[PDB]
Structure 1
């Protein structure tokens, strides 16, 4: 009943997350950057109808807000083989080219796994749901990711933008990783016996035995939920000696 014991920790019961201890993010532009407003290639009604519900949900959650901005990038209707279930995919390439680069601190999976001792064979794998959306964007940086949204009937006039770290932004992975590392620094200190690996939104908790893996997992779940993050109950792999993590199958300390 791991789900019932930690309602606030699961995306299924705790609602959309929000990293309350993290200050809204300010995105520095390169020294020569000036706003660019790229035209929206007219979208077919089909793509527009598949995307509508997603845009409405995001608006209700406050993840998206109306705005007027000198910046504007294309919205694209990416989908599965067919005409069913779409999703809003933004082309932030002209924006990415204009924001100042940061040192990529997220380690590659190979080097990250090398830090897993053979002594810790009891694993718990958690996948944070809508990770980037948990980090707020400072109002001064929000205009940067604006895009056009139209709907014949009543609703919005033109541009919408994000209030949270969006998808497609080149620095989202790194900024989320560093943010979660700051939020879990304490947890690592209070649990010296545990091994916690972080790869953006993919987490692996390692323990010496089955008990302290259960007690540690309870602790991480409690902590994650309190901090405003949300783990997917569906994918969760709790206290197993065999788990799927970052493409590998961990067992006997192999791979």
Structure 2
């Protein structure tokens, strides 16, 4: 009820980001939403003395039919001061990624009960555009903590920990983690028990609240079952020339990750100009080298460590037939997580929808494990991505991304 003083970083003005084009249905939905928010005092109309802007659009949360307003606060978040005044930070709970079930709740509506510092409100300006720019865009700013702003969970952190205090000590084995508008609550019990303690949680914010439009939904994870991928080599009875070339190529690549990998006995097998489909018998020396490489690849990569002061980088490869591989790392060849998706749902004919869902699930895994979002290297042309990703987005955060325009040779090795 009284405002925390907030400021931008030194020598840094507010965001001035262009509003991107919105469809008729989106603009309409936002006009209806913002009219309600203005009546509730959450936002106010602003004048032309406010030159700042942050893009807004509208989405559908997973498994619902009601529009949710989503503000792209990525630039404001970069420019906003870092929040270490009461706490250097919330030391990320390493136990969250070890629970059997983690449910994600959209608690962002609770943020609207705390006023935003009157001097900082101007930096939250946004515009509802009109079709064909036929009428002036409707300009608002926030009067309360906005959803999607990195300062909202920080300013609300003191109020949230008191809200949850009765639930915490009645259920001491439960991990509860807050990232932006999401609450992650992990448990090891039966899913039926799990779902019931989730709804017990919901009551605590129901009670304190007196209505939250998206508090009742739950996206359930199982980080205990999360799969990884070690490097594996084929097991064959007959090797063609082409088979051995692909093996040597894959081992050459793997030797950047594992020092002890050797390929010289195997490369000697290719000595000769034989047809690509001709079977080559392995020499004893080549089979021993192959066996020793297999053993090396069963071991973890040497010198892999997470540094919270460095960015996480996520790379994605399209493997065809709806399957996608990805790696998360900070230094090249020191992967912190790798994986593969194929279950991308409601998109067997839409490459970009599949990629958008992959980005969202990789970001979710990143938040659970390290408490921050990776920067993505996307195998897509910038113009294709920017035209369509907002049509399939259903998370309340947005990571940063860049675009890969040269085809990687490494795609063959992660397949």
Q: TM-score, normalised by structure 1?
A: 0.56
Residue deviations 1:130-176 (CA, integer Å, cap 9, x gap): 34643522333222211234669xx9985311123224424445545
Q: What is the rounded CA distance, in whole Å, between the counterparts of 2:186 and 2:59 in structure 1?
A: 33
2:80 aligned partner: 99
Greater share of residues in helix: 2
Aligned pairs, number: 209
Q: What is the rounded CA distance, in whole Å, between the counterparts of 1:180 and 1:138 in structure 2?
A: 19
1:164 aligned partner: 144
Q: Secondary structure at the match of 1:169?
A: coil
Counting only pairs closer than 5 Å after superposition, residues 183-198 of structure 1 correspond to structure 2 as 183-189=163-169, 191=170, 193-198=172-177
Higher relative contact order, chain-length normalized (CA < 8 Å, sep 6+): 1
1:226 aligned partner: 207
Does the CA-based 8 Å contact 2:7-2:80 persist in structure 1?
yes
Give the one of 189, 202, 216 matched to 2:183: 202
- After superposition, the Cα gap between the structure-2 partners of 1:192 and 1:141, relative to the gap in structure 1 and judged at 3 Å, is same
Q: What is the rounded CA distance, in whole Å, between the counterparts of 2:77 and 2:10 in structure 1?
A: 14
2:50 aligned partner: 70
| Rg larger in structure | 2
Q: TM-score, normalised by structure 2?
A: 0.38
Does the CA-based 8 Å contact 1:72-1:146 persist in structure 2?
yes
Counting only pairs closer than 5 Å after superposition, residues 1-255 of structure 1 correspond to structure 2 as 23-35=2-14, 38=16, 40=18, 43=21, 46=24, 48-68=27-47, 70-77=50-57, 88-103=69-84, 105=89, 111-113=94-96, 125=103, 127-131=105-109, 133-136=111-114, 137-149=116-128, 159-176=139-156, 179-189=159-169, 191=170, 193-200=172-179, 201-204=182-185, 206=187, 220-228=201-209, 230=212, 232-235=215-218, 244-245=220-221, 248=223
Q: What is the rounded CA distance, in whole Å, between the counterparts of 1:44 and 1:193 in structure 2?
A: 46
Q: Secondary structure at the match of 2:140?
A: strand
